Homo-oligomer: A and B are copies of this chain.
Amino acid sequence: SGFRKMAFPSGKVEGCMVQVTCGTTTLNGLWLDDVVYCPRHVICTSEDMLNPNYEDLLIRKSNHNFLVQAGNVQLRVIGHSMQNCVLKLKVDTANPKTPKYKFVRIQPGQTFSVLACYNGSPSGVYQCAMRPNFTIKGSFLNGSCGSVGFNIDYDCVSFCYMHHMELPTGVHAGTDLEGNFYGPFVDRQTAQAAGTDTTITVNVLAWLYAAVINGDRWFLNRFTTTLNDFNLVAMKYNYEPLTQDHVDILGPLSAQTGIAVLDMCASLKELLQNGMNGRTILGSALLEDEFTPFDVVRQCS
């Protein structure tokens, strides 16, 4: 019993973290096979961050300008290209610690584990969610840049996130491993709008199922409701609209608790309208939206 924001074990990713230096700038890189991946802003001097021409900056750079360290061992850079907002440095050595892996673009609402690093050394691991507005609320300091997010299916690491920026508002933006930003962000030091963040409704319902499963049942009410009536309330409170896809992926949790999705939706409606009244659910005084129905099922299995 019990329910915790649990991260995937980080071992497989620790053995891939390297330090990448280019002039004065140091940040983290991801060493898979004979390629190192990092944010391309490693080639920027602080004086170019307002509006860098990344091509033009990269053009004044040759292989030997890139200092890739893995612990003690230096690596030799025998090729460099720029793919969207990441540098791919081809090195002489295949990573002997390279796990099985894929690159995946996740969708807003999905969760992943983050290994927060500094100078190519892992410092910490936490679980978080791609917010609907494609930001993440992480824990990143200067030099955390290039820190990666991942899921682990069996022996297979799926890398979904590389950290590039903290926004003027204190939240975090980054790319997939092909260097395409999540959201409307660019790797420039300008004031950039995140947009309105909404609550991931399907996740809040998964958490409610998690709570029922762990003995917290007080919010269960006599009522039920409609997908339409529910979504009307959802929009008022900046909750994402709930679809039949969402109802479908909540099925296993419906099945295990013997509570219909729409009766759970009706409990949620009331919590939204009446607040928590001073009560708590799985030790929280706030509605949690950073567990997927998959995360709840995994932890409860």
Contacts and interface: CB of A to CB of B under 8 A. Distances in A.
Interface of A: 1-11, 14-15, 115-116, 122-126, 128, 137-141, 166, 170-172, 214-215, 275-276, 278, 280, 283-286, 298-301
Contact of A139 (B3, B116, B215): B3
Contact of A11 (B14, B172, B214): B14
A185 to B, nearest CB: 16
Given A2-B137, A2-B172, 11 more contacts: A1-B170, A2-B166, A3-B139, A4-B124, A6-B125, A7-B124, A9-B10, A123-B298, A284-B285, A284-B286, A285-B286
Given A124-B7, A170-B215, A138 B2 contact: yes
A11 B138 contact: no
Contact of A122 (B11, B139, B280, B301): B11
Contacts of A128: 4
Contacts of A138: 2, 4
Contacts of A170: 1-2, 214-215
A11 B5 contact: no
A284 B290 CA distance: 13
B139 A9 contact: no
Tally of this chain's copies: 2
A297 to B, nearest CB: 12
Nearest to A3: B139
A8 B10 CA distance: 9
Contacts of A125: 6-10, 125
A124 B299 CA distance: 9
B2 A115 contact: no
A116 to B, nearest CB: 7
A1 B124 contact: no
Contact of A126 (B4, B280, B283): B4
Nearest to A286: B285
Contacts of A137: 2, 283
The 3 closest A-B CB pairs, nearest first, are: A285-B285, A11-B11, A6-B124
A280 to B, nearest CB: 7
A170 to B, nearest CB: 4
A127 to B, nearest CB: 8
B215 A9 contact: no
Nearest to A118: B301
A147 B15 CA distance: 23
Given A137-B283, A140-B1, A166-B1, A126 B11 contact: no
Contact of A124 (B8, B11, B284): B8
Nearest to A116: B6
A14 B9 contact: yes
A140 B128 CA distance: 20
